[PDB]
Amino acid sequence: MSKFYKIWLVFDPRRVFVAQGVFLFLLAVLIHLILLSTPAFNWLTVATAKHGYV
Amino acid sequence: SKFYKIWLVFDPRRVFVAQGVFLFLLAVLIHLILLSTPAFNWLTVATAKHGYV
Amino acid sequence: MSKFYKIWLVFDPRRVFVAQGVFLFLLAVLIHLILLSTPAFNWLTVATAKHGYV
Amino acid sequence: YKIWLVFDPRRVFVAQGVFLFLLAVLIHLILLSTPAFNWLTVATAKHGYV
Amino acid sequence: DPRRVFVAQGVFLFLLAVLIHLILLSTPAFNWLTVATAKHGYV
Amino acid sequence: SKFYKIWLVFDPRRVFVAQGVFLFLLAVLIHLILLSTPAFNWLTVATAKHGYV
Amino acid sequence: MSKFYKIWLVFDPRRVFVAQGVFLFLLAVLIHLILLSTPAFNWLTVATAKHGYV
Amino acid sequence: SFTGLTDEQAQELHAVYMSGLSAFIAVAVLAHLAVMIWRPWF
Amino acid sequence: SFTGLTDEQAQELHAVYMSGLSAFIAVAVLAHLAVMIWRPWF
Amino acid sequence: LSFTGLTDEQAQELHAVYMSGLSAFIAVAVLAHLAVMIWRPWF
Amino acid sequence: LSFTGLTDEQAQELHAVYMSGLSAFIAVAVLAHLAVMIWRPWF
Amino acid sequence: SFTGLTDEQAQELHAVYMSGLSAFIAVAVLAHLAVMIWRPWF
Amino acid sequence: MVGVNFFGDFDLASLAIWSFWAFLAYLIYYLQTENMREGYPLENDDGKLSPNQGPFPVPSPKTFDLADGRKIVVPSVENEEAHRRTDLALERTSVNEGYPFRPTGNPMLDGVGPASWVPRRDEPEVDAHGHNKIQPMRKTEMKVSAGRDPRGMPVQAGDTEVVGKIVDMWVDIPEQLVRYLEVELNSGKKKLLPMTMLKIWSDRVRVNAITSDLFDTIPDIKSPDVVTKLEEDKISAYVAGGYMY
Amino acid sequence: ALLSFERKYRVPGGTLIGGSLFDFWVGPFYVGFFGVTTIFFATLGFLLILWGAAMQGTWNPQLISIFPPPVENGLNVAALDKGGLWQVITVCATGAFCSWALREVEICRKLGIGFHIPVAFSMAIFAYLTLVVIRPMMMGSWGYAFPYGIWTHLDWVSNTGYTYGNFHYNPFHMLGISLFFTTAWALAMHGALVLSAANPVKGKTMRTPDHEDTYFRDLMGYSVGTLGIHRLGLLLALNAVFWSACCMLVSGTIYFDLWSDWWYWWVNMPFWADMAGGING
Amino acid sequence: AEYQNFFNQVQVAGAPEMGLKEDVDTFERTPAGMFNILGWMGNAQIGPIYLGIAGTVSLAFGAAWFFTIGVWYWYQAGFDPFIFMRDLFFFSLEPPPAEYGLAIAPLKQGGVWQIASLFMAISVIAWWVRVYTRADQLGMGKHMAWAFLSAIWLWSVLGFWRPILMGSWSVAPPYGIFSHLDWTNQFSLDHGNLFYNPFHGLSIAALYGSALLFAMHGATILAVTRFGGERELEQIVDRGTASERAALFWRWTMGFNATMEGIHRWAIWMAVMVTLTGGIGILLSGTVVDNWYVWAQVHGYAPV
């Protein structure tokens, strides 16, 4: 809908902005941590194997 | 049909907050349950399929 | 009997609905967990056996 | 009917609902913990599930 | 106070009944589940 | 274009201090992660390349 | 930017200078200690090897 | 009445409560009979 | 009435609530039928 | 019976917006489930 | 109705700014996901 | 205005902030390009 | 980093412990300096500036902003001057420092020793709304919800005599706490008795701090329904001074 | 020197012994008869610890240790080179602590305040006497008390705890641990709340106690109050020390086995002991 | 025989205080009530509680963590309510074994532990945000948030940072009454008598000091309640005889004293120190030092 702007009529922008920032940061950190803990998607390990760094 | 009257008993602020929290918790729970099942862990499936490590 | 509606003349709809929602979610999660804890009725395990997943 | 002259039905109904739910859950758990009356166990034995 | 009397009486009745039922369940001789399993051969 | 209005929402002092702390912590974390990985430890790479020790 | 001086209109100079001094000293000490823990860049070990001190 | 409910209100509340109780007990009796047929415990 | 609702307000509230409850119960019944077909537990 | 102090038309408009959002969310979920079923069925 | 005191025009302006920011963020995320899929697909 | 600042004050602050951010991001991009040339991680 | 030493046996644990020692030294300095905002500079027995002032310097002044526009600079000359007693009826017992000062007259009446009071601001303590924090219960809608109600009880002093009856209680409205009991003496005058220095029995209120003769000279409140901080300090000092005197 | 408000409080009276014989100050320190005794006992104990360091042969402050007489000595007064020095130091410490408490009582009487501080200190004195006197004598020897050393008494704590398996399973010990944790938590909360009321956001006026009550009611739905929080902190600390003392009193005197084994009466109650399943079969 | 002011002799009560508005949304506050049992030592009012977003997130995810542990216990009990009560303190939700490292483990082998840990972390972060924002909306100085951050630091070192540095979730403590005590004892045994960890000793010193300082401060305040000493803020801005008498007691006792405001700085730092040093001590164990007794022998405070 084009009437989604009315969300700012229900909630204060500062509250929502802080909540969204915290949520996005936590989600990004969690996904990066999950990928790093998996050896098949740890990009440092993949780079080491591909380029023969060690 | 006349379900809009829900907003005559419940304030949208509380309802929206509770619904957002519930959706986030449910999505996280389902994704974690699937990840903890190796047969449905998509990272493990991709590793096996594409020959990673 | 059509007189049951009078419950709303003695109980607050807001608290009743909040408690009902919490109770229904907890009950559904409990039943799903009971089914999952049983290997015979774990649908993920059944699918793994059926389709030969690893 | 006179009981509602003494006790507030709201507290009575809340307590009765909690009590009934707890009792039903307790009985179901007792039956589940008994393999003889665990209906899922009987079902997997009868239908030959894995 | 009739209210407190009735509430305490109900709580005490429930606790007593549950206690007796748990004592009977704890005893295999008077545990009706085991008795029924043996009688009907549920095993 | 109109994102300057963010300073009509949050106090610049607290935002600046928090952003500086966050950036420093992130940079230190990434550098420590690279140091703890022998493949990207630049001192180890240097001593292997130049034949130190 | 030619308008960076206005940072001093936002933050008290005394606190900024004290925090900067503490931060710079801690960073310099940390980097020096990191170099000292690596025998390939420990200048005392290199001097000992070169001059045959020990 | 400590609750403030008149005699008529108490009577109608009791009537609704007993109707609901009778429905609940009938469902419980049917469930018990079905269990007894399927897996008797006596 | 403790809640202050009118009798007609209570009737309308009950009507919409029972419509929602009927939808929920019908969905649950269909789900149970599907599970019974796919993997019966009796 | 408005505890929230909302009129009928305001409630209808809010419900319309909420239903649009809910429909979008449910449509995305349906598409995701269809894609998962095609890629890796769980039945 | 208004719980925050903002007028509808102010809400629309704030939402326009927010949607511009959200669109930029989502576009960057989509580009990153395309790059990851090209480099190392997870399906 | 939640912070109480003016349009002109906010814009003047934002210009300087964006200048600093652009300088920081340019330096970071140069560092990443140099690292990729030296020790690529892909 | 197990066994990795920067020099000798100095490893990460050694660096952490030495850094903690330095930080603790600085923290102790900071905490000691923050606690020197009252009572300084030090004086001698004659009230003159003490030649020794300690190793810790007095910190730079800090300002407290009050709700009514008043500014308090706690380490300042004005703050010390406002709280300084004058015309103390005291006398040195020795030429040397460190000896006690002897009260010249009546220590309880003169307000010295354990009966000492501090000249606090002569205004009532207010809440966040600006209302007086301590008010008699007759001016409020509070009721006794537990304990023993002392209103109407006789008041017995430390010499086993009846000096009056309790007529009202004074309550901290924001905290919902009884702080004073109002007593009507046999002479018709009304006094305020701190709650913390009396006992409520089943049939009487016992005040062992002072005797019957001292009840008549308890400091008074200017207004029958308002008690100021200075009046509170004076009353508390007078009542507490009875244990020694 | 004197504080700017100190002169009007330095009045005679309040002593327990000696009248005005010792009723004077030395610098900031009020002396009194018990202050004289405190200085004597403390100096003697410190110098005897130094002498024991000389006999031990080490001057490292972290290695100095004075040990009690061996367990085989019983309750006898031991030779100074065979544990008697520990007994003399223990007597000096007890005298110093009691004299400190009585000096605090005198200072309280001079200033016209309560005796909560000396009572609370007497609680810690009771704990110390429990560790060095009551328990060793109930076990029949001075050799069961802890030594006077910065880390050797930690070794004593470790050995005493492992005498009964894992000491975590002592119930009074669990209660004392919970009380100490609660005391630390409450101290943190109280300090933070008072400082946040006294040091508000820049540009705001000083906050009232109403602000503190509102804050803690908003955060968790309850506020204990300033008087309440002070009472609660004092009671928490006193109960923590008392129950620690009880936990040490019951160990080795009426209980000698493993506390983890004590915890098994609940499991071994016959009505569910044989029920198969769970952790304990 | 005198009144010691440990319990109120009489209680008074009117309408409950609903709190100052300031910058707080009063719509998020619940109703309030009274509990006379709590009025003997403190306040009888079970006042309104703020709901908000952070509180809702924290409550939901904390309940999720609690119920995850509970359902794991029920699974370990085999649905038996009697086994559930018989072995309640013996049930344990253990972390994944060391073989799986930091990766997602199967449900039966630590996946449930990881799910509960994530729920707990979300709840704790939400509650910290709640503490900070409730301080901010009333115009207060954020001291509570920084004090909470030290406990969060110790908690995250135990469960997150040290497991990451050690390379496996297995080194994290389990969710159980007796099991986590066993984990504590085994940690001490594995790292060579944690008594000889210097930061462990500092943390113990800070804990003992917190108990000692709260005893001192509570006894001092109750001793000067004759002069309204518990009204600490007013004493800070308008010094009374209570503050002077407390300061003089401690100055005559030990030669130095505090102020009505700075004593709380002492208190907050003493209480923060136990967790601040404990986190460092735990983080150093296994990553830098694996045998603290040998380390003490090397560094001159253990016999050779």
Ligand code: BCL
């Ligand atoms: C309570 C149960 C155990 C015990 C278990 C532990 C454990 C476990 C630990 C300590 C620790 C310490 N213990 Mg011990 N300790 C006991 C009995 C004592 C007694 C005593 C006479 O009762 C004393 C004085 C000490 C003293 C000390 C300190 C050296 C240290 C920090 C305490 C602290 O800050 O407390 C709070 C008090 C303050 C903050 C105020 C200042 C107190 C100062 C620091 C005391 C210094 C004493 C000095 C070294 C020697 C005194 C004699 C001299 C002749 C003056 N212990 C008994 C036997 N103790 C910790 C440590 O680091 O050990 C190496 C530690 O890990």
Ligand code: BCL
């Ligand atoms: C045999 C066992 C070992 C030993 C092993 C350990 C280990 C291992 C550890 C300690 C730790 C501690 N030990 Mg030790 N310890 C021993 C002997 C002692 C002795 C003694 C003999 O007298 C003492 C006094 C201590 C004292 C202490 C503390 C000083 C220290 C930190 C306590 C704390 O705050 O914990 C508990 C506080 C927390 C965990 C903070 C929690 C913060 C979070 C945010 C709050 C809870 C989360 C959430 C809200 C919960 C739900 C609440 C809902 C309302 C239901 N140990 C011996 C030598 N000890 C810790 C430490 O720091 O060591 C350096 C630690 O990890």
Ligand SMILES: CC[C@H]1c2cc3[nH]c4c(c3C)C(=O)[C@H](C(=O)OC)c4c3nc(cc4[nH]c(cc(n2)[C@@H]1C)c(C(C)=O)c4C)[C@@H](C)[C@@H]3CCC(=O)OC/C=C(\C)CCC[C@H](C)CCC[C@H](C)CCCC(C)C
């Ligand atoms: C509610 C109980 C808590 C508490 C309370 C408490 N302690 C108190 C007080 C209170 C209320 C005081 O008023 C009093 C004080 O003045 O504090 C400033 C005191 C005090 N608590 C102290 C310490 C202390 N309290 C501790 C504990 C606690 N005290 C409890 C947790 C500990 C711990 C756990 O280790 C210590 C170290 C002192 C700072 C002080 C008492 C000072 C005193 O007694 O001074 C006179 C004595 C001397 C100056 C030195 C005497 C030295 C001896 C003659 C020789 C040494 C003997 C000793 C046995 C050697 C020990 C070696 C160690 C390695 C074992």
Ligand SMILES: CC[C@H]1c2cc3[nH]c4c(c3C)C(=O)[C@H](C(=O)OC)c4c3nc(cc4[nH]c(cc(n2)[C@@H]1C)c(C(C)=O)c4C)[C@@H](C)[C@@H]3CCC(=O)OC/C=C(\C)CCC[C@H](C)CCC[C@H](C)CCCC(C)C
């Ligand atoms: C300086 C260090 C000390 C300290 C500090 C400290 N802790 C703090 C603070 C501070 C300064 C806070 O601001 C914060 C706070 O809000 O305190 C009131 C907190 C706090 N410290 C807490 C606990 C705590 N602190 C501890 C320790 C300490 N905290 C240290 C001693 C410990 C210990 C010793 O282990 C504990 C357990 C909390 C009371 C609180 C943080 C609250 C929090 O994080 O909440 C989020 C977590 C949850 C909601 C978890 C779930 C809770 C329930 C189990 C949910 C399930 C039940 C459901 C609601 C009901 C079910 C009913 C039936 C269906 C069964």
Ligand SMILES: COC(C)(C)C/C=C/C(C)=C/C=C/C(C)=C/C=C/C(C)=C/C=C/C=C(C)/C=C/C=C(/C)CC/C=C(\C)CCC=C(C)C
């Ligand atoms: C281990 O033990 C086991 C789990 C095996 C057995 C235990 C079992 C139990 C306890 C099973 C269940 C017992 C119950 C009680 C199940 C639930 C039955 C119910 C009561 C279902 C209720 C469904 C109600 C639903 C969806 C709500 C319909 C209401 C919908 C919106 C709300 C409409 C009302 C409104 C909106 C307010 C607006 C209207 C106006 C006029 C303003």
Ligand SMILES: COC(C)(C)C/C=C/C(C)=C/C=C/C(C)=C/C=C/C(C)=C/C=C/C=C(C)/C=C/C=C(/C)CC/C=C(\C)CCC=C(C)C
């Ligand atoms: C284990 O479980 C896993 C992790 C696998 C499951 C993962 C799950 C989830 C839960 C994924 C995400 C769900 C969501 C909901 C993701 C986010 C969707 C959103 C809503 C993203 C929002 C992006 C918004 C962004 C950056 C904000 C753009 C706003 C930018 C500045 C702010 C502009 C607004 C302004 C400035 C104020 C100026 C105007 C005025 C009038 C003052």
Ligand SMILES: COC(C)(C)C/C=C/C(C)=C/C=C/C(C)=C/C=C/C(C)=C/C=C/C=C(C)/C=C/C=C(\C)CC/C=C(\C)CCC=C(C)C
């Ligand atoms: C362990 O158990 C498992 C997990 C296996 C199974 C258990 C499963 C369950 C219990 C699954 C789910 C049950 C539910 C109830 C899932 C959720 C269903 C819902 C109710 C989804 C709702 C999505 C709602 C969405 C997107 C709507 C968000 C609404 C909006 C954008 C509309 C905003 C309206 C507004 C802004 C302002 C208008 C104001 C005016 C004045 C016009």
Ligand SMILES: COC(C)(C)C/C=C/C(C)=C/C=C/C(C)=C/C=C/C(C)=C/C=C/C=C(C)/C=C/C=C(\C)CC/C=C(\C)CCC=C(C)C
């Ligand atoms: C485990 O997960 C891993 C670590 C792998 C991945 C996680 C990753 C993330 C989440 C990385 C980063 C996300 C972000 C958000 C990074 C930072 C983006 C930003 C926004 C960086 C900002 C740099 C800003 C900079 C330099 C600007 C500082 C501002 C200034 C110099 C301007 C000064 C402002 C004002 C001076 C004074 C003017 C005053 C007046 C009155 C005109």
Ligand SMILES: COC(C)(C)C/C=C/C(C)=C/C=C/C(C)=C/C=C/C(C)=C/C=C/C=C(C)\C=C\C=C(/C)CC/C=C(\C)CCC=C(C)C
């Ligand atoms: C009938 O009863 C029911 C079923 C209703 C509920 C009964 C429930 C019970 C019995 C609940 C709990 C009993 C216990 C024993 C709860 C826990 C007690 C403890 C002692 C919890 C201790 C946690 C202790 C420590 C260190 C944990 C710190 C945890 C952390 C930092 C969290 C780590 C966060 C995240 C690791 C990892 C994220 C990474 C991924 C890959 C998700």
Ligand SMILES: [Fe+3]
């Ligand atoms: Fe305090």
